[PDB]
Symmetry: D2
Subunit: 95 residues, 4 copies
């Protein structure tokens, strides 16, 4: 289930305007990505945030969050493809 | 495979963490995208349509580096959660067939 | 879906278990195959190429009924183990990415 | 992993010749299908065998084992297809 996929798209755009907002978005993304996670959450919430404030670190912190969101989308995406492609191969072994 | 993709990433991520240029950060990025486009048609058009992080200045580098960390980290956890979801969906479907 | 397939089977299996004809056992079979060929090209040629269990005698019926039980049971557990394998492969792949 | 798939094919043919052999094959099939199974094995080994001896019950018991093996193959097969098809749909949601 890729609800997360659609949310990444929308969350991606908000990534630009004129820091609480930035920190807020990252948090949203992580909560939606967690859904249900086992204690593995530690790694996902192990100082998994942007680095802090001066404008420099806000230009920086905001770039970090564009790549993070693109990464999730394409990681999810290629993994999803692997899945479809593996099931096909496994089947091509029918013969 | 998907394991091959993850382990390289873990590596590219450590390769950037300790950095100084304009060719290093651009290569790490190319490298990562070279790994994903393991036979997936023209959707490669999404990654191969640039999507590259924006004598260069010093501050400009830091900003670009930060974006790379997210890209590399995003790909890692994006895969990870696609995997866990795949595993949970099979779990559920098994319990539906209680018998 | 795959859950839809399993639950119908559980039902067809109980529909045969308590039987007396030559049209009942043939319908239960048709029914099961009608369920599998949920949009899968010409591989339907495998199931739709007869593959039907062999005024008929009495003993002949018992033999045919037994074969149906295996077919219905086979489809159930065949799915079940494809599901568990799918779930285990995702599990493993997750543990490879220890970090 | 569909090793089981290839074994079903081979095990399927042995299904005809001229009861220990019959009972032996079913057992083989179940062991190869178990690989690793959780306590769920009970259901798979809950009087999951052919019914016993007179020829009548050997014609019968052997028919049961042809369908069982065909069933496993096509159950595994369609489930495998579902898998590939679901991963594709989930992806078609990218847009």
């Amino acid at each position: 289930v890729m609800r997360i996929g659609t949310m990444i798209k929308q969350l991606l755009e908000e990534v630009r305007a004129a820091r609480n907002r930035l920190r807020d978005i990252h948090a949203t993304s992580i909560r939606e990505l967690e859904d249900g996670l086992a204690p593995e959450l530690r790694e996902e919430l192990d100082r998994l945030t942007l680095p802090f404030p001066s404008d420099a670190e806000l230009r920086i912190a905001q770039a970090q969050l564009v790549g993070w969101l693109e990464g999730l989308f394409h990681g999810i995406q290629t993994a999803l493809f692997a899945q479809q492609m593996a099931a096909r191969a496994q089947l091509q072994q029918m013969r």
